[PDB]
Design a protein around this ligand. Structure first.
Ligand SMILES: [Ca+2]
Ligand SMILES: [Ca+2]
Ligand SMILES: [Ca+2]
Ligand SMILES: [Ca+2]
Ligand SMILES: [Ca+2]
Ligand SMILES: [Zn+2]
Ligand SMILES: [Zn+2]
Ligand SMILES: [Zn+2]
Ligand SMILES: [Zn+2]
Ligand SMILES: [Zn+2]
Ligand SMILES: [Zn+2]
Ligand SMILES: [Zn+2]
Ligand SMILES: [Zn+2]
Lengths: 389, 402, 400
């Protein structure tokens, strides 16, 4: 039901969940200790319930952004690897799995937006953000346009918002700083400034969302979109000749897109911690391990320095990786959830004219901190009340 | 409300804008840039409504205390005055036009509380409290009190409470230690302890606010009262031979009144800021720039050193200026509103005899420091829930102790 | 009223209150000062409301934690014994009577938890928890049990949880750092992890409460229980042959129980301030004074010399020994809320339905919130009760 003498891995239904059980068998063929990968529905939500009673999986596969829940909630064993092993991945990926200093997951793959352009329309794409109105008046003449991506979401509008100085919090020494909301600076100010120009300079429409936009790339009706690897197959179907690259540097400085690291945390309740350790280190995080997990469902950039260079032959993959190095690791705290919506509102207020540049960002910042007290206070009410009962 | 090639100023409609509008033409005369000056009822309320959409006036006049609200709201521009021009203004005012680094406005006119006596009654004032008892009893033999002032207002009583070591928050570099309130302390402890004693020693009363106290002074029923420049009109009308001078000291320290400095800021959204920095830096802050503005309706004292001297000849002004230089450049930070009211509680219960000095003040920490979060938190809740089994119930009431 | 030159003391009915009234005799004698000890009702509710109006006793006896609530609400006079005196009582007792670096009460009695154990079944006590399971084995065979105590309560359990590194709020420099809580740290985990291992390995009994605990010992059906100086009364009564000793250590590291301190404080309003310290330090603190108090109701164990005459009693001896190795019950407001969430942790961690560092981090998270909800709530109250009382007065009086 729960336990011991074998591993019960969890990974989201849509991942290389077979390609992993392929590896999980390579394991059984060497140790004599069985592996059982499962993929239940709401599997990111079930976890805490069953870990609260101390049951479920020995290990958990998921984006790092969620474990800061589990790890805080107390549901992750602080894993210790070896330095000469921690040197087999990439430097930053280990940062996506810190908590209080305590490493709590093994990174697997990477997730980041990259510039996606039409090969049949652009040579050779824009080196920077600064000359994209110049590129656009050329193509708005052909019936087309230069670029189109979502504006009803930070995650997309963030890479540009950051670029020049704007952060979210301050990761310091394995330590996120929740009283340092990196939005109300000239870096994130002049980022957002630049953007809402091409909105009112008519290089982009205000109500441009994920679907309406996406579709228009292919087509080829718009010349560029900013999107992540999870999009490719739709474009692949359109035939539409496309390439992928490092995002347009802004003010000379590289863009800062969020980084989503597929992780594999080991359960605090797991009695098989050793076995899992071995499984992940000796078998999964080998090349041919991720040669088996990619080959079911592509992983984008992987964490293994080792087995990134073999996948790097693919141009589309190398750009993802470079981007995710010039990227900015997505935070994993509670405050995150709450931060999102303020900026989600800030940009939606700036894009519309409801407010301006310097205003909406103040409105998030101070807010962000204040609103957080409400979310934190409510947590007590829920925890308090419940108990009393 | 724009563009572009002209500025639009707003100023309170009791302030001498005619003098400011008189700069309008004399400035418009040398540059061509037409200037229209407006007194829009509720501007200090209205301004954010418009400022935060890409509008408003181009530059704004108001007390520095409300300029915190604006700067945080990212509404005012960081202005960088060339460049040893700061030396042509009083050093302390620049600690009313600053926000976590950002020098957020141009300070014009210093207001502040002062000591006004009845020259015709008590010819030469006390420079200390202590002898106020001695004085009430002295004049009582003529059927008049000695001092009477708004007890009901901390703003008016704070000077005293603070005198010995009390403070709002610890300022020290465009920065206040928001957590560190100074109403706890041993300074303020002994401060109010005096004021309290004054009431029960029969010297003065509890029901002593503006109305009663102005009536009482303006008829010559008391020797001295504590008031700002605003009352000046009314005592002139009630034909008294009055005199404003520096506030009585207590326990050997100057009284720390509350310094409010009229500042002029610039809409951070406005297309033409460079003009305000020629208008304000080059024209409005002159001798006959401020002069004219003052000459409509008196500014109070002035943040400028030069025309301060010219005005300092009138003692009343010189006293106001001096009082400010003994005071605390009133915190513009937003939990100041919470600070306020939670002493207006403390000083009353202590005054009524319902509580003691040491009790109230201490509890004041609870008045401010939690109402601070509740004030801003209660505001955030709406903004979030406003624009944008099935759980345990909503407050605004949460739960009781056990 | 409020006194005026006479000493009204306020001790609780169950403390040495006739014996204290006796020291009000040698004091008066050669100082000529009228002294009334009177034992009121729930004086930790009466005091803060008479204190508020400058009324009440000139002197209040009581545990220091409620004294927190008072010193906090600015109700108590900072007092000074000299450095020559300071060195008179034990140092650790000083770190209990210190709000914001300001020394606010005089300590007279310590109240710590003990290993209270039956000599007839276990004539040499366990010095370690580690063996406690392996001991139950031998005891179960004899028809009896090894150890019982109220699990449905932190105050008892904490001492073990506290063992390896578990603290409430981090004591550092005269003030208990409120943000630094230490229920999560690995040390505490270990502390509870052991208690749960005991409760699920059936050495313990889940719904073991106080009655079930001491009564199973006072009847003589378990080798040991964990209690304090209050319980002695009855163990004696049933003739149970007992000693009391130092509790057991965990990882060679010693058990760490909460120290409570029966303390005398001085009303900040109290008109007759100077008399009090002359009364206390020079007449009460004295050996015979304390003896006299004790000579009515035993105070248990706090004066570093007079201690010895009592300490001849081994059971009192251990209470001290224990309390020296112990954490002190801190006095600020966050404490009360802490107790609620630490209860949670233990109580359902015992139930398997929360495991384990789970219940033990969610506590650290309840604490952070049940904290700044508790403060915020008590402001909102203190407001809507002095904005109302105001209107009522504004309307009541006004009207006609
Ligand atoms: Ca299953
Ligand atoms: Ca190794
Ligand atoms: Ca107009
Ligand atoms: Ca009585
Ligand atoms: Ca003796
Ligand atoms: Zn499924
Ligand atoms: Zn353009
Ligand atoms: Zn291969
Ligand atoms: Zn008007
Ligand atoms: Zn007197
Ligand atoms: Zn002149
Ligand atoms: Zn002149
Ligand atoms: Zn066992």
């Amino acid at each position: 039901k729960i336990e011991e003498g074998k591993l019960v891995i969890w990974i989201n239904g849509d991942k290389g969940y077979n390609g992993l059980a392929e590896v999980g068998k390579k394991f059984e063929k060497d140790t004599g200790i069985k592996v059982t990968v499962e993929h239940p529905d709401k599997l990111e939500e079930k976890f805490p319930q069953v870990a609260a009673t101390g049951d479920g999986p020995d290990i958990i596969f998921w984006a790092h952004d969620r474990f800061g829940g589990y790890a805080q909630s107390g549901l992750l064993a602080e894993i210790t690897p070896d330095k000469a092993f921690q040197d087999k991945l990439y430097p930053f990926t280990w940062d996506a799995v810190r908590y209080n200093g305590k490493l709590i997951a093994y990174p697997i793959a990477v997730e980041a937006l990259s510039l996606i352009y039409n090969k049949d329309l652009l040579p050779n794409p824009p080196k920077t953000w600064e000359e994209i109105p110049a590129l656009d008046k050329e193509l708005k003449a052909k019936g087309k346009s230069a670029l189109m991506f979502n504006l009803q979401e930070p995650y997309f509008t963030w890479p540009l918002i950051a670029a020049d100085g704007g952060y979210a919090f301050k990761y310091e020494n394995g330590k996120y700083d929740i009283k340092d909301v990196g939005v109300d600076n000239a870096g994130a100010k002049a980022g957002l400034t630049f953007l809402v120009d091409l909105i009112k300079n008519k290089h982009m429409n205000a109500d441009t969302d994920y679907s309406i936009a996406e579709a228009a790339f292919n087509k080829g009706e718009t010349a560029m979109t900013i999107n992540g690897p999870w999009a490719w197959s739709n474009i692949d179907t359109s035939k539409v000749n496309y390439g992928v690259t490092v995002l347009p540097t802004f003010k000379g400085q590289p863009s800062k897109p969020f980084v989503g690291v597929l992780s594999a945390g080991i359960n605090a309740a797991s009695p098989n911690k050793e076995l899992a350790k071995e499984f992940l280190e000796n078998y999964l995080l080998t090349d041919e391990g991720l040669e088996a997990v990619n080959k079911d469902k592509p992983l984008g950039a992987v964490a293994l320095k080792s087995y990134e260079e073999e996948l790097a032959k693919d141009p589309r993959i190398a750009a993802t990786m470079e981007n995710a190095q010039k990227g900015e690791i997505m935070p994993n705290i509670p405050q995150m959830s709450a931060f999102w919506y303020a900026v989600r509102t800030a940009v939606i207020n700036a894009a519309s004219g409801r407010q301006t540049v310097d205003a909406a960002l103040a409105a998030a910042q101070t807010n962000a901190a204040a609103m957080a007290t409400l979310e934190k206070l409510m947590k007590a009410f829920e925890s308090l009340k419940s108990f009393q009962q």
